[PDB]
Design an enzyme around this catalytic site. Structure first.
Site, PDB file in Angstrom:
ATOM      1  N   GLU B  58      41.131 -22.264  20.503  1.00  0.00           N
ATOM      2  CA  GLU B  58      42.531 -22.547  20.788  1.00  0.00           C
ATOM      3  C   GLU B  58      43.216 -21.278  21.268  1.00  0.00           C
ATOM      4  O   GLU B  58      44.094 -21.315  22.127  1.00  0.00           O
ATOM      5  CB  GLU B  58      43.228 -23.068  19.530  1.00  0.00           C
ATOM      6  CG  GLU B  58      44.522 -23.828  19.800  1.00  0.00           C
ATOM      7  CD  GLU B  58      45.533 -23.660  18.680  1.00  0.00           C
ATOM      8  OE1 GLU B  58      46.036 -22.527  18.516  1.00  0.00           O
ATOM      9  OE2 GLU B  58      45.821 -24.644  17.960  1.00  0.00           O
ATOM     10  N   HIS B  59      42.801 -20.154  20.705  1.00  0.00           N
ATOM     11  CA  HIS B  59      43.360 -18.865  21.069  1.00  0.00           C
ATOM     12  C   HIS B  59      42.975 -18.381  22.458  1.00  0.00           C
ATOM     13  O   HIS B  59      43.611 -17.478  22.990  1.00  0.00           O
ATOM     14  CB  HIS B  59      42.925 -17.816  20.064  1.00  0.00           C
ATOM     15  CG  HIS B  59      43.854 -17.670  18.908  1.00  0.00           C
ATOM     16  ND1 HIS B  59      44.802 -16.672  18.840  1.00  0.00           N
ATOM     17  CD2 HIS B  59      43.987 -18.396  17.774  1.00  0.00           C
ATOM     18  CE1 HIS B  59      45.479 -16.788  17.713  1.00  0.00           C
ATOM     19  NE2 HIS B  59      45.004 -17.826  17.048  1.00  0.00           N
ATOM     20  N   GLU B 135      47.470 -13.429  12.190  1.00  0.00           N
ATOM     21  CA  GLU B 135      48.102 -14.718  11.997  1.00  0.00           C
ATOM     22  C   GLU B 135      47.741 -15.186  10.597  1.00  0.00           C
ATOM     23  O   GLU B 135      48.558 -15.780   9.911  1.00  0.00           O
ATOM     24  CB  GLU B 135      47.621 -15.741  13.021  1.00  0.00           C
ATOM     25  CG  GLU B 135      47.783 -15.293  14.461  1.00  0.00           C
ATOM     26  CD  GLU B 135      47.730 -16.450  15.453  1.00  0.00           C
ATOM     27  OE1 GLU B 135      47.017 -17.433  15.164  1.00  0.00           O
ATOM     28  OE2 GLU B 135      48.391 -16.375  16.519  1.00  0.00           O
TER      29      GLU B 135
END
Lengths: 79, 442
Positions: B58-59, B135
């Site tokens: 996703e990153h 994160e």
């Protein structure tokens, strides 16, 4: 009111399962008994002694008492 | 009339490409739109060694593809005023775009280029690795999500679902260009994907542009078959992360849910509609209709609380969460469990009638804009295998009555061993046993 003012606790996680997802008396031979024995051993030589040392004193005092009730023929060899 | 406005809602078109991908969309008279691909992948599909990949992916999904690297890709999207967003849960991942209908096709191209040709530039990975790692530290301070994670962690302990969507620290420190590549090549596949869209788009112009960039065909029968996952076992248990240093405590409690397909989910929702939710900024205060909310207010029981019905393919989590001060945890919990019991044993027609209206208004608001609609289409197909229109939902909700709410809640809540997670200064909340007994007798 005692639950909430007991102790300052930090960073300890615990995990437990509902009583219904587990066994009441589990690992009787693999864990239970081995420890029953473990516990029994660690103490015998602390408890047993003085209790045994009591029994003896009991037996002696008892038998000696009865003995002192018996007659000694060495009181009547003469006459 | 409400009734009519529903019937008059245009239909959702669904056509399947010879390759297995499904294209769906709802056309409105709107100049702007939202199109995207919703995927049947996620942390659940991961394993002990690749847990987190789907997130690492996703990153990178946006850091550029092979056909057009980072700088270019970014520049090409910004410059057309389109918004590119996406996410990833335990059983669902999705990348979608918000742009004018006029660019519906150039968008579709971009999408397909992202899911099919992610760069995975060896140099980018090592950077996003440091990024994800931070994160995690930021999220670690969000008690609400730290709690739900733990909730899962134990509710589904020992299984696929007991894994965090972000993943382990190790896993992220060592995952490889390969593992990531593998994940994409193993999971991002047509039969498990849905190109959904909503706005001022022509299904045709969409489906056409679809066949054009989503051409990849499958040969064997395996490639056409969606793999069924080994199911996850629920476990009545608790996990207590204590830290008296935190200002408030977080508690989550739940029983196992039925899973997407089951109809009861409607009633279950109607149920949570009754208990509802609260948060110190609700002005209704003591007059709120929700009994729990009231007590919460009358007795300063908590800062907030929410009921939830998190569903999954084959299971789910039906419970509640609340934030309270160290010394009001017990009363709060006590009252809470009370309401669950009230659901099972003494619900009123008056209660449900309202709960329903609140629910109806809820479903309708879930489709407030194009992104939200697209998100609903992308999901209904992926989970229900089709689209459930407000016209339908409404009928299913309208049919719910007290006698019904009772039976269901009883069926899923009464005398069930729940899964519980507590974080913070939770000393006053105690004993699973006690909590377990709050599971019966109103």
């Amino acid at each position: 009111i005692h639950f909430g003012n007991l102790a300052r606790v930090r960073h300890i996680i615990t995990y437990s399962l509902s009583p219904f997802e587990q066994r009441a008396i589990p690992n009787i031979f693999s864990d239970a008994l081995p420890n029953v024995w473990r516990r029994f051993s660690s103490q015998v030589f602390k408890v047993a002694p003085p209790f045994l040392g009591a029994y003896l004193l009991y037996s002696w005092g008892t038998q000696e008492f009865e003995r002192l009730k018996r007659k000694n023929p060495a009181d009547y060899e003469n006459d | 009339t409400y009734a009519q406005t529903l019937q008059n809602i245009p239909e959702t078109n669904v056509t399947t490409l010879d390759n297995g991908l499904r294209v769906a969309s709802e056309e409105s008279s709107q100049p702007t739109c939202t199109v995207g691909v919703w995927i049947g992948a996620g942390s659940r599909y991961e394993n002990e060694k690749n847990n987190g990949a789907g997130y690492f992916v996703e990153h990178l999904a946006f850091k550029g593809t092979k056909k057009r690297p980072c700088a270019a890709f970014e520049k090409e999207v910004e410059s057309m005023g389109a918004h590119f967003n996406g996410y990833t849960s335990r059983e669902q991942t999705a990348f979608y775009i918000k742009a004018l209908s006029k660019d519906m096709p150039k968008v579709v191209e971009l999408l397909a280029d992202v899911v099919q040709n992610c760069a995975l530039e060896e140099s980018q990975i090592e950077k996003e690795r440091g990024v994800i790692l931070q994160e995690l530290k930021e999220m670690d301070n969000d008690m609400t999500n730290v709690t739900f994670d733990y909730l899962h962690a134990t509710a589904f302990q020992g299984t696929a679902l007991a894994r965090t969507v972000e993943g382990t620290t190790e896993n992220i420190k060592h995952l490889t260009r390969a593992d990531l590549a593998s994940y994409i090549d193993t999971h991002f596949k047509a039969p498990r994907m849905v190109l959904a869209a909503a706005g001022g788009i022509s299904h045709k112009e969409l489906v056409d542009a679809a066949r054009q960039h989503f051409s990849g065909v499958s040969f064997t029968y395996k490639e056409d078959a969606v793999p069924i996952l080994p199911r996850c076992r629920f476990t009545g248990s608790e996990i207590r992360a204590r830290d008296d240093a935190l200002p408030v405590a977080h508690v989550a409690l739940a029983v196992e849910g039925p899973g997407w397909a089951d109809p009861d989910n409607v009633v279950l929702h109607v149920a949570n509609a009754i208990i509802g939710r609260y948060d110190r900024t609700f002005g209704g205060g003591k007059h709120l209709s929700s009994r729990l909310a009231a007590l919460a207010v009358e007795h300063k029981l908590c800062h907030s609380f929410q009921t939830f019905n998190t569903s999954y393919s084959d299971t789910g989590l039906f419970g509640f969460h609340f934030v309270a001060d160290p010394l009001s945890i017990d009363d709060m919990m006590f009252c809470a469990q009370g309401e669950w019991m009230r659901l099972c044993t003494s619900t009123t027609e008056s209660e449900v009638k309202r709960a329903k209206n609140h629910l109806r208004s809820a479903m309708v608001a879930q489709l407030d804009g194009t992104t939200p609609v697209c998100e609903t289409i992308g999901s209904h197909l992926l989970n229900y295998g089709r689209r459930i229109s407000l016209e339908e939902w409404d009928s299913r909700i309208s049919a719910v009555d007290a006698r019904m709410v009772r039976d269901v809640c009883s069926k899923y809540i009464y005398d069930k061993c729940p899964a519980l997670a507590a974080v913070g200064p939770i000393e006053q909340l105690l004993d699973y046993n006690r909590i377990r007994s709050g599971m019966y007798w109103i």
